[PDB]
Every structure is written in C-alpha cells, then in structure tokens.
Amino acid sequence: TPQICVVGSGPAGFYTAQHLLKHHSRAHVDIYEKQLVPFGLVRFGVAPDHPEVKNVINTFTQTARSDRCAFYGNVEVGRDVTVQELQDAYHAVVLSYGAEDHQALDIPGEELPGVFSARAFVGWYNGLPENRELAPDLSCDTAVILGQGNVALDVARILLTPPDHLEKTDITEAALGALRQSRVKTVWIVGRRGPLQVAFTIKELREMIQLPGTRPMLDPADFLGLQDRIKEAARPRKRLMELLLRTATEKPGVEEAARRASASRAWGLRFFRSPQQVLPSPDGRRAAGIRLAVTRLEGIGEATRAVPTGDVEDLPCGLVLSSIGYKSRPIDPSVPFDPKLGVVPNMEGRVVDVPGLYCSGWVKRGPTGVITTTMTDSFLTGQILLQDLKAGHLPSGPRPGSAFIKALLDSRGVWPVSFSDWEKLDAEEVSRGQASGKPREKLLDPQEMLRLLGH
Ligand SMILES: Cc1cc2nc3c(=O)[nH]c(=O)nc-3n(C[C@H](O)[C@H](O)[C@H](O)COP(=O)(O)OP(=O)(O)OC[C@H]3O[C@@H](n4cnc5c(N)ncnc54)[C@H](O)[C@@H]3O)c2cc1C
C-alpha cells in the first residue's frame, strides 16, 4: 500500500488528496494541518458574507471520509515533525501549506497603532486564533486600504455593511460587536497604478456598488480614455472596466440618486498613489493619516510601472489596512526556497532536486490563484506524483506512514486531531450558533477545543 501525505489542509491539500484517492485505488493519504480544524483559507480567509464560496467544504468533507484518508490536526510541520521525517515515513510528500506571511509595507510609521495587514484583519473576523486579540480601534471615521484586489474589497465591505446584515453570518460574535460600535463611515481603496490595473473581479466590484447604506465615490478624471483602451479587450476585462466607467461617469436615476443621497457611509477608489509614510496623531499614540506619493504610468500594456511625479498627498484616516501581497515562508531547513517569489522551487510540482517531494497550491505557484485555479492546478500535481509513482521513481516496497509518525508525536506530547474530532468540534460550533441565528459560532480557544475532545 503506497503511503502519501500532504502538508496543509486548505484547498491545495484537499484537492490534491482528492485526485490521489480517485486515481489510485489503494494509496493512503494523510493530511497534516497546524490549526486544529481543517480547510485553511476557505474558513479563515473567505469572508463571512460569502458563505456560498465556502461550499467547497462539502467536497473536502467527502474526501476526508474516504476510508483511505486521515486528517492530523494540531500538527505544525517544521516544528512538531520535520519534513524529512515525513519524507522517510511515506513514499511521497506534498507541500501545500499556503503562503502565511504578508509582505510588510516597509514605510516609516507602519508600526503605529491602527496599521494592520488586511489578511490579519480578516483573520480577526474569521476566527483565526492568532488574531483573536487584534482589537482594532474602529473609533476613527475613515479607513484607508492599500492595494486594489478582492481582499481589499472584502475588508471594505465588512467595515461598511450595516451590522444587522452581518448578524446571521458566521462572523465572530466578538468582531460583530466591534463593528456595532464602529464609527467608520468612509473607506478609501488606494492603488498605485490605474483603473486598468485594478485586480478585483466583477462579482465583488458590483457587490461593492450595491452594498446597502453606502455610496461609491469614483473620480471621472481617472477614467478618461477608458472606453477607448478597452475597445479590443477580452470580455472579462472589458465588462469590469465598463462597470467602473459607468459608475464613474453616468448620472444614476431618481431612485439611485436618492439612495446615494441618504447613505450614511461611503467608499471610493483612489489611483496613482503609493504609500510613503503613516502619519502620526499629535500625541504619537496612533495613526491619523497616510502620506501618499503621486505616481504617473509609463510603458505599455501589462508592463506599465508607476513612477513618482514628485508630488505627495496627505490623506487623513485612523486605520491603515495593507493588502498588497502574501508570501510563503520556509518551513523546514531541508526544503528549498526562492525568497524572491516566495515559493518552493518546483517543476510542475516536483520540488527542485528532492525526489518524492511535491508541491501544490499557493506554495507551488505564488499567491495569485483563486480556489478554482488552486483546484485544477492541484490535480496537475497529483497527476505527476502518481505518474512518477507508476514509473517507479519513488522508493519501493514498504513504508510505515502514520504508524511511524504517530510514534514521534506521542513521544513529543503532541495531541493530533482526527477528522472525527473535527466533526465533534463542528457540532459544538453549530450548537452554539443556533441560539443567535448563525450557521456556527466559531471556537477561538485551542485549549478549550482540546478539552472538549477529552484531553
Ligand atoms: C482573505 C481571502 C479571501 C479569499 N476569498 C476567496 C474567494 O472568495 N474565492 C476564491 O476562489 N478564493 C478566495 N481566496 C483565495 C483562496 O483563499 C486561495 O485560493 C486558497 O485558499 C489557497 O489554498 P492553499 O490550499 O494553497 O492554501 P491555504 O488555504 O492558505 O491553506 C493551506 C493550509 O496549510 C496549513 N499549514 C500552514 N503551515 C503549516 C505547517 N507548518 N504545518 C501544517 N499545516 C500548515 C494552513 O494552516 C492551511 O490550512 C481568498 C484568499 C484570501 C486571503
């Protein structure tokens, strides 16, 4: 019986195991995860008001219920067990542990209270234990988000949705209460390039424009010559661009003009501005604005690079959210790493110079794909791995798998969480969300979670 194992239980991992299980009748797959619960960013990243995006959990679960698959929660690879150990124990090892860091802003004042990375702000509301005590000061009246992608859109939306519309989501009870007292009435999504280079997608952009109680603030001037450049543009790009174009230059209607008129909150899109410095409040105890450098685009097409003009702009705010870039981290000494592209060097999923060591998901291609890309691309990694297996390019005969690895964990006093254990944790989250109308009220304390399991 071939023994394969994966590191990370997000889409990369589950989808790679899914393929392995479907295309190899007797292989056994073990999924190691550092958090106590599986699913990674489907649970800690996808916003709470996008439950439909989280329905892939339904396919993760049927994969995890195969009699040849087992989940190992609460096992931090590169600390509880090394990659080499995993490598000696199994015939193949798949690195799929995402891209955990965020790229720092690297600008003076980035330390000031009120400056957060967008991904941490999402973990706060998404119940990722390490962000539980993030306690953001939502008492200011404005928030600036650096970077124009969906993550930026996601936090903007959550800071402006009227709290009652969030009430039946799976957002944490604690974050909900923070939003209820929030005084944040305006959200600027600042980018350094232009409308052509925003990275968001149409489903999010239109949810932003139709978000009850809010009114968009686009400057007509940013969209000059827009309709002329997108003339040749493919459907996706063009539709998006006309949606931005239309919202920026057309007069609305009598009902939509009126709705915008009475909206208490607002959100805009700023362009050709790059983060230069976080501005201090008079007393130095918090952020009170951000110093932006004016930029001008040069070069053609997909190769346009902003260049400073020399001009700067001070933009007041009491919250600076950075969402410009996630990067993988080197997990074990023995694992190759490309610090530039924050990825583990590989050739279609085969790690550079280390037989039996594969990769998939963000750690394989960079932090760009959405779940479907990650989905399909992960099946490509499973294809290679099983081809190498079939060609006999993995060690032969017999490997112990979990039998060996379980021993090491036991001896180190690491208590692994099985799939069943997660099912017991799931039940409790559901039961405690019933009283308040929610799909679940997430468990934030690992000790508490371990004790409900009997440890
Ligand atoms: C805020 C946000 C919102 C998003 N919204 C959407 C959306 O709406 N739709 C969409 O299609 N995509 C969305 N995405 C993109 C999607 O989240 C990614 O495509 C996808 O989850 C990346 O999959 P992954 O399996 O590589 O990594 P991840 O999902 O990050 O997870 C990999 C797993 O590895 C585990 N792990 C990490 N280190 C270790 C270790 N040392 N030992 C053991 N286990 C470890 C992590 O805990 C994690 O569970 C969003 C991303 C973000 C950040």
Side-chain angles (χ1 to χ4, degrees):
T1 155
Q3 294 282 339
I4 323 168
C5 88
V6 311
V7 184
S9 56
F14 264 104
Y15 278 133
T16 311
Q18 188 190 148
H19 175 95
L20 300 170
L21 284 180
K22 174 178 205 272
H23 298 283
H24 193 286
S25 84
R26 341 228 221 93
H28 189 98
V29 179
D30 297 333
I31 306 167
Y32 289 78
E33 164 64 47
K34 69 159 161 43
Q35 291 295 169
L36 270 54
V37 297
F39 313 141
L41 296 173
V42 169
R43 147 168 185 129
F44 297 112
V46 175
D49 57 342
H50 293 156
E52 67 291 352
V53 165
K54 321 173 105 82
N55 98 99
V56 288
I57 287 177
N58 287 315
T59 132
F60 301 168
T61 298
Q62 43 173 17
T63 290
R65 289 176 177 163
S66 156
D67 72 324
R68 292 171 287 139
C69 185
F71 173 68
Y72 289 90
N74 193 40
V75 178
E76 174 177 334
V77 185
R79 173 199 90 185
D80 290 342
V81 50
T82 62
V83 173
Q84 190 63 63
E85 298 180 324
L86 284 176
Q87 314 189 57
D88 308 322
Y90 292 97
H91 299 92
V93 167
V94 191
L95 298 191
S96 43
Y97 59 81
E100 199 186 343
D101 297 344
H102 65 281
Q103 312 204 223
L105 251 31
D106 265 13
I107 56 175
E110 71 171 325
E111 56 256 21
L112 284 160
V115 166
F116 303 89
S117 96
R119 183 152 157 169
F121 181 93
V122 173
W124 169 66
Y125 62 71
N126 269 343
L128 178 77
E130 78 188 77
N131 294 110
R132 133 171 127 272
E133 310 304 353
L134 181 69
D137 192 358
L138 305 198
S139 66
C140 56
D141 54 51
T142 292
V144 161
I145 308 179
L146 307 152
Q148 294 170 330
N150 287 351
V151 177
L153 279 190
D154 276 356
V155 307
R157 207 173 56 271
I158 267 79
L159 288 159
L160 304 168
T161 296
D164 296 13
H165 298 15
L166 261 29
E167 181 164 280
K168 296 268 171 277
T169 64
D170 76 4
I171 191 160
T172 62
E173 209 168 63
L176 191 63
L179 299 151
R180 281 174 165 150
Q181 307 295 301
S182 167
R183 329 199 95 182
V184 176
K185 265 64 191 184
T186 309
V187 173
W188 303 102
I189 307 180
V190 183
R192 52 172 166 28
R193 299 190 289 148
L196 249 176
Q197 305 75 37
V198 309
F200 36 80
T201 54
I202 198 153
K203 181 268 203 169
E204 301 76 13
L205 180 58
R206 156 158 48 219
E207 276 178 326
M208 207 51 209
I209 297 172
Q210 298 187 47
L211 194 71
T214 67
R215 58 178 182 77
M217 288 182 298
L218 292 180
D219 184 323
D222 288 302
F223 307 83
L224 267 334
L226 220 210
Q227 191 59 77
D228 302 12
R229 297 180 78 153
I230 57 184
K231 170 188 279 71
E232 147 183 349
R235 205 172 181 169
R237 201 48 160 169
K238 211 186 184 301
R239 204 162 153 284
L240 181 76
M241 231 61 63
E242 304 167 322
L243 182 46
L244 279 172
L245 226 207
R246 287 204 294 303
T247 315
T249 42
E250 146 184 322
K251 202 214 186 85
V254 160
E255 306 85 288
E256 173 63 20
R259 201 189 59 65
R260 299 183 179 184
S262 65
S264 49
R265 295 163 198 262
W267 70 275
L269 225 58
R270 297 300 301 286
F271 293 95
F272 315 102
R273 292 299 187 270
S274 80
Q276 188 178 269
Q277 169 184 177
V278 170
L279 305 188
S281 45
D283 64 353
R285 318 227 300 161
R286 58 190 281 192
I290 192 169
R291 170 68 59 67
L292 301 172
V294 184
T295 68
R296 168 176 61 73
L297 277 160
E298 282 167 9
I300 324 88
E302 301 182 1
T304 61
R305 313 151 282 143
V307 310
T309 77
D311 267 31
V312 311
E313 171 186 359
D314 293 349
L315 179 50
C317 57
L319 281 179
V320 175
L321 270 171
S322 150
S323 67
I324 43 63
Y326 313 150
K327 200 157 53 288
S328 287
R329 77 165 62 186
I331 178 179
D332 197 279
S334 79
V335 174
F337 190 68
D338 180 340
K340 160 64 210 264
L341 325 179
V343 79
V344 165
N346 67 101
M347 196 298 198
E348 294 303 311
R350 299 212 193 80
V351 176
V352 179
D353 286 344
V354 190
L357 187 67
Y358 299 77
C359 64
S360 78
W362 280 10
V363 81
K364 167 179 167 183
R365 298 302 187 186
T368 15
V370 295
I371 306 175
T372 35
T373 322
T374 300
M375 181 180 90
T376 53
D377 169 83
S378 292
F379 298 164
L380 295 186
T381 279
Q383 289 190 62
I384 333 302
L385 183 175
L386 288 203
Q387 173 57 34
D388 293 335
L389 184 154
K390 193 188 184 202
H393 296 117
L394 307 165
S396 36
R399 295 217 166 172
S402 71
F404 172 79
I405 297 293
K406 279 190 288 163
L408 308 167
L409 305 173
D410 286 345
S411 154
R412 295 159 183 190
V414 159
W415 249 283
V417 180
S418 62
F419 201 66
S420 268
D421 287 335
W422 153 248
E423 290 177 313
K424 284 166 190 266
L425 284 177
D426 190 35
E428 182 66 25
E429 298 196 326
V430 176
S431 154
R432 49 164 84 174
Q434 293 267 305
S436 44
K438 291 172 165 183
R440 63 179 52 262
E441 182 67 64
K442 293 177 186 174
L443 283 147
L444 324 180
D445 182 21
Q447 257 57 47
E448 186 187 342
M449 278 184 269
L450 292 178
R451 304 183 287 261
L452 293 159
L453 279 197
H455 316 319

mmCIF file of all heavy atoms in Angstrom, residues 421-446:
data_model
loop_
_atom_site.group_PDB
_atom_site.id
_atom_site.type_symbol
_atom_site.label_atom_id
_atom_site.label_comp_id
_atom_site.label_asym_id
_atom_site.label_seq_id
_atom_site.Cartn_x
_atom_site.Cartn_y
_atom_site.Cartn_z
ATOM 1 N N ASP A 421 -12.742 14.054 15.306
ATOM 2 C CA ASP A 421 -12.520 15.075 16.327
ATOM 3 C C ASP A 421 -12.978 16.422 15.781
ATOM 4 O O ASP A 421 -13.685 17.234 16.407
ATOM 5 C CB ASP A 421 -11.069 15.079 16.792
ATOM 6 C CG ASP A 421 -10.639 13.922 17.670
ATOM 7 O OD1 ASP A 421 -11.478 13.301 18.359
ATOM 8 O OD2 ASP A 421 -9.405 13.596 17.694
ATOM 9 N N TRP A 422 -12.648 16.678 14.502
ATOM 10 C CA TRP A 422 -13.165 17.919 13.908
ATOM 11 C C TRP A 422 -14.692 17.867 13.796
ATOM 12 O O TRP A 422 -15.400 18.882 13.902
ATOM 13 C CB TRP A 422 -12.510 18.107 12.538
ATOM 14 C CG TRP A 422 -13.405 18.900 11.631
ATOM 15 C CD1 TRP A 422 -14.041 18.444 10.517
ATOM 16 C CD2 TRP A 422 -13.832 20.244 11.875
ATOM 17 N NE1 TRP A 422 -14.787 19.463 9.997
ATOM 18 C CE2 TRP A 422 -14.697 20.572 10.806
ATOM 19 C CE3 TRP A 422 -13.571 21.196 12.872
ATOM 20 C CZ2 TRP A 422 -15.297 21.814 10.704
ATOM 21 C CZ3 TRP A 422 -14.178 22.438 12.743
ATOM 22 C CH2 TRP A 422 -15.040 22.756 11.643
ATOM 23 N N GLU A 423 -15.237 16.663 13.529
ATOM 24 C CA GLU A 423 -16.699 16.584 13.413
ATOM 25 C C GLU A 423 -17.331 16.909 14.754
ATOM 26 O O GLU A 423 -18.321 17.622 14.820
ATOM 27 C CB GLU A 423 -17.131 15.306 12.745
ATOM 28 C CG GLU A 423 -16.745 15.322 11.258
ATOM 29 C CD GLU A 423 -17.100 14.023 10.571
ATOM 30 O OE1 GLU A 423 -16.772 12.952 11.152
ATOM 31 O OE2 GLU A 423 -17.700 14.067 9.474
ATOM 32 N N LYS A 424 -16.711 16.483 15.858
ATOM 33 C CA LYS A 424 -17.167 16.825 17.193
ATOM 34 C C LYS A 424 -17.002 18.323 17.446
ATOM 35 O O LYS A 424 -17.808 18.939 18.131
ATOM 36 C CB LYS A 424 -16.381 16.067 18.265
ATOM 37 C CG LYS A 424 -16.811 14.604 18.395
ATOM 38 C CD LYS A 424 -15.759 13.854 19.230
ATOM 39 C CE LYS A 424 -16.024 12.351 19.157
ATOM 40 N NZ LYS A 424 -16.862 11.993 20.337
ATOM 41 N N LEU A 425 -15.952 18.930 16.885
ATOM 42 C CA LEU A 425 -15.756 20.367 17.104
ATOM 43 C C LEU A 425 -16.776 21.160 16.317
ATOM 44 O O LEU A 425 -17.308 22.178 16.750
ATOM 45 C CB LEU A 425 -14.326 20.750 16.777
ATOM 46 C CG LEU A 425 -13.241 20.409 17.749
ATOM 47 C CD1 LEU A 425 -11.859 20.790 17.251
ATOM 48 C CD2 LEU A 425 -13.518 21.118 19.082
ATOM 49 N N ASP A 426 -17.060 20.651 15.122
ATOM 50 C CA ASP A 426 -18.049 21.247 14.205
ATOM 51 C C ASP A 426 -19.403 21.289 14.918
ATOM 52 O O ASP A 426 -19.990 22.370 14.989
ATOM 53 C CB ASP A 426 -18.139 20.448 12.929
ATOM 54 C CG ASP A 426 -18.903 20.982 11.751
ATOM 55 O OD1 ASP A 426 -18.932 22.208 11.487
ATOM 56 O OD2 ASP A 426 -19.488 20.150 10.989
ATOM 57 N N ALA A 427 -19.864 20.155 15.423
ATOM 58 C CA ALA A 427 -21.139 20.080 16.123
ATOM 59 C C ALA A 427 -21.266 21.201 17.152
ATOM 60 O O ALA A 427 -22.219 21.976 17.047
ATOM 61 C CB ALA A 427 -21.393 18.728 16.771
ATOM 62 N N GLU A 428 -20.290 21.305 18.051
ATOM 63 C CA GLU A 428 -20.305 22.335 19.090
ATOM 64 C C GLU A 428 -20.407 23.733 18.484
ATOM 65 O O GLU A 428 -21.115 24.566 19.062
ATOM 66 C CB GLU A 428 -19.112 22.207 20.021
ATOM 67 C CG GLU A 428 -18.965 23.143 21.181
ATOM 68 C CD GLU A 428 -19.989 23.051 22.284
ATOM 69 O OE1 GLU A 428 -20.611 21.982 22.462
ATOM 70 O OE2 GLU A 428 -20.179 24.069 22.993
ATOM 71 N N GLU A 429 -19.752 24.014 17.356
ATOM 72 C CA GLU A 429 -19.809 25.358 16.799
ATOM 73 C C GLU A 429 -21.208 25.616 16.283
ATOM 74 O O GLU A 429 -21.678 26.755 16.333
ATOM 75 C CB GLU A 429 -18.736 25.565 15.753
ATOM 76 C CG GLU A 429 -17.316 25.441 16.226
ATOM 77 C CD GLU A 429 -16.274 26.015 15.279
ATOM 78 O OE1 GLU A 429 -16.439 25.955 14.039
ATOM 79 O OE2 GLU A 429 -15.269 26.557 15.791
ATOM 80 N N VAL A 430 -21.838 24.558 15.769
ATOM 81 C CA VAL A 430 -23.192 24.676 15.249
ATOM 82 C C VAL A 430 -24.169 24.908 16.398
ATOM 83 O O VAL A 430 -24.916 25.890 16.383
ATOM 84 C CB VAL A 430 -23.632 23.498 14.383
ATOM 85 C CG1 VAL A 430 -25.104 23.654 13.972
ATOM 86 C CG2 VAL A 430 -22.774 23.403 13.118
ATOM 87 N N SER A 431 -24.143 24.031 17.381
ATOM 88 C CA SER A 431 -24.982 24.137 18.567
ATOM 89 C C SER A 431 -24.908 25.506 19.218
ATOM 90 O O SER A 431 -25.959 26.034 19.623
ATOM 91 C CB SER A 431 -24.606 23.011 19.530
ATOM 92 O OG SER A 431 -24.882 23.296 20.876
ATOM 93 N N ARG A 432 -23.745 26.156 19.281
ATOM 94 C CA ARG A 432 -23.643 27.471 19.898
ATOM 95 C C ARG A 432 -23.933 28.631 18.964
ATOM 96 O O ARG A 432 -23.891 29.807 19.368
ATOM 97 C CB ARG A 432 -22.401 27.648 20.731
ATOM 98 C CG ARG A 432 -21.076 27.287 20.171
ATOM 99 C CD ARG A 432 -19.906 27.868 20.939
ATOM 100 N NE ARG A 432 -19.502 27.086 22.096
ATOM 101 C CZ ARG A 432 -18.417 27.389 22.814
ATOM 102 N NH1 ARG A 432 -17.697 28.445 22.454
ATOM 103 N NH2 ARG A 432 -18.069 26.634 23.849
ATOM 104 N N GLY A 433 -24.346 28.340 17.734
ATOM 105 C CA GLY A 433 -24.728 29.399 16.807
ATOM 106 C C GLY A 433 -26.247 29.359 16.605
ATOM 107 O O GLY A 433 -26.797 30.283 16.008
ATOM 108 N N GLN A 434 -26.877 28.301 17.091
ATOM 109 C CA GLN A 434 -28.316 28.117 16.961
ATOM 110 C C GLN A 434 -29.124 29.167 17.698
ATOM 111 O O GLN A 434 -30.082 29.727 17.166
ATOM 112 C CB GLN A 434 -28.694 26.706 17.448
ATOM 113 C CG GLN A 434 -28.149 25.600 16.571
ATOM 114 C CD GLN A 434 -29.052 25.091 15.472
ATOM 115 O OE1 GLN A 434 -30.199 24.685 15.767
ATOM 116 N NE2 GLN A 434 -28.571 25.074 14.227
ATOM 117 N N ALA A 435 -28.736 29.464 18.935
ATOM 118 C CA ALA A 435 -29.418 30.449 19.754
ATOM 119 C C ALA A 435 -29.460 31.808 19.065
ATOM 120 O O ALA A 435 -30.520 32.447 19.071
ATOM 121 C CB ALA A 435 -28.795 30.580 21.134
ATOM 122 N N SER A 436 -28.345 32.238 18.478
ATOM 123 C CA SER A 436 -28.309 33.533 17.819
ATOM 124 C C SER A 436 -28.539 33.554 16.334
ATOM 125 O O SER A 436 -28.194 34.576 15.717
ATOM 126 C CB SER A 436 -27.027 34.288 18.233
ATOM 127 O OG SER A 436 -25.915 33.403 18.189
ATOM 128 N N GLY A 437 -29.129 32.550 15.704
ATOM 129 C CA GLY A 437 -29.416 32.584 14.284
ATOM 130 C C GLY A 437 -28.326 32.306 13.271
ATOM 131 O O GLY A 437 -28.628 32.225 12.067
ATOM 132 N N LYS A 438 -27.087 32.127 13.664
ATOM 133 C CA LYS A 438 -25.898 31.860 12.901
ATOM 134 C C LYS A 438 -25.675 30.402 12.501
ATOM 135 O O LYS A 438 -26.035 29.472 13.229
ATOM 136 C CB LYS A 438 -24.673 32.217 13.809
ATOM 137 C CG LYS A 438 -24.479 33.685 14.099
ATOM 138 C CD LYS A 438 -23.391 33.940 15.126
ATOM 139 C CE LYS A 438 -22.936 35.380 15.154
ATOM 140 N NZ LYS A 438 -21.813 35.632 16.099
ATOM 141 N N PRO A 439 -24.969 30.173 11.400
ATOM 142 C CA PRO A 439 -24.609 28.849 10.915
ATOM 143 C C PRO A 439 -23.648 28.157 11.889
ATOM 144 O O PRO A 439 -23.668 26.942 12.052
ATOM 145 C CB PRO A 439 -23.879 29.077 9.606
ATOM 146 C CG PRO A 439 -24.285 30.447 9.193
ATOM 147 C CD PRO A 439 -24.437 31.217 10.480
ATOM 148 N N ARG A 440 -22.848 28.975 12.585
ATOM 149 C CA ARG A 440 -21.947 28.472 13.612
ATOM 150 C C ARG A 440 -21.381 29.676 14.365
ATOM 151 O O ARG A 440 -21.398 30.768 13.788
ATOM 152 C CB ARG A 440 -20.808 27.668 12.945
ATOM 153 C CG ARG A 440 -19.919 28.505 12.030
ATOM 154 C CD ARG A 440 -18.761 27.764 11.377
ATOM 155 N NE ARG A 440 -19.146 26.570 10.687
ATOM 156 C CZ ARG A 440 -19.111 25.302 11.061
ATOM 157 N NH1 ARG A 440 -18.614 24.892 12.228
ATOM 158 N NH2 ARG A 440 -19.593 24.416 10.178
ATOM 159 N N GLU A 441 -20.955 29.501 15.590
ATOM 160 C CA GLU A 441 -20.242 30.491 16.380
ATOM 161 C C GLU A 441 -18.879 29.761 16.601
ATOM 162 O O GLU A 441 -18.821 28.810 17.369
ATOM 163 C CB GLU A 441 -20.744 30.908 17.733
ATOM 164 C CG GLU A 441 -19.919 31.995 18.419
ATOM 165 C CD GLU A 441 -19.986 33.345 17.712
ATOM 166 O OE1 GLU A 441 -21.106 33.920 17.657
ATOM 167 O OE2 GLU A 441 -18.947 33.848 17.218
ATOM 168 N N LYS A 442 -17.892 30.220 15.871
ATOM 169 C CA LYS A 442 -16.565 29.617 15.912
ATOM 170 C C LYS A 442 -15.903 29.575 17.273
ATOM 171 O O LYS A 442 -15.955 30.498 18.086
ATOM 172 C CB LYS A 442 -15.688 30.312 14.851
ATOM 173 C CG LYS A 442 -16.120 30.057 13.405
ATOM 174 C CD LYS A 442 -15.234 30.847 12.444
ATOM 175 C CE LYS A 442 -15.697 30.761 11.004
ATOM 176 N NZ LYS A 442 -14.950 31.631 10.061
ATOM 177 N N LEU A 443 -15.175 28.485 17.513
ATOM 178 C CA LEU A 443 -14.407 28.281 18.737
ATOM 179 C C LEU A 443 -13.025 28.893 18.519
ATOM 180 O O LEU A 443 -12.306 28.430 17.637
ATOM 181 C CB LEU A 443 -14.251 26.795 19.087
ATOM 182 C CG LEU A 443 -15.460 26.090 19.707
ATOM 183 C CD1 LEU A 443 -15.546 24.628 19.303
ATOM 184 C CD2 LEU A 443 -15.361 26.156 21.241
ATOM 185 N N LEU A 444 -12.667 29.864 19.328
ATOM 186 C CA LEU A 444 -11.410 30.568 19.244
ATOM 187 C C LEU A 444 -10.293 30.074 20.138
ATOM 188 O O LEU A 444 -9.121 30.457 19.928
ATOM 189 C CB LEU A 444 -11.702 32.024 19.715
ATOM 190 C CG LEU A 444 -13.052 32.622 19.328
ATOM 191 C CD1 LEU A 444 -13.170 34.046 19.868
ATOM 192 C CD2 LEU A 444 -13.316 32.602 17.836
ATOM 193 N N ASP A 445 -10.584 29.273 21.160
ATOM 194 C CA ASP A 445 -9.552 28.817 22.098
ATOM 195 C C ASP A 445 -9.186 27.360 21.995
ATOM 196 O O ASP A 445 -9.913 26.436 22.350
ATOM 197 C CB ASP A 445 -9.999 29.216 23.492
ATOM 198 C CG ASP A 445 -9.141 28.928 24.689
ATOM 199 O OD1 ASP A 445 -7.917 28.714 24.620
ATOM 200 O OD2 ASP A 445 -9.740 28.915 25.811
ATOM 201 N N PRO A 446 -7.985 27.107 21.492
ATOM 202 C CA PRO A 446 -7.426 25.791 21.309
ATOM 203 C C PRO A 446 -7.403 24.908 22.539
ATOM 204 O O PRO A 446 -7.604 23.675 22.430
ATOM 205 C CB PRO A 446 -6.026 26.087 20.766
ATOM 206 C CG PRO A 446 -6.197 27.386 20.031
ATOM 207 C CD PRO A 446 -7.046 28.171 21.015
#
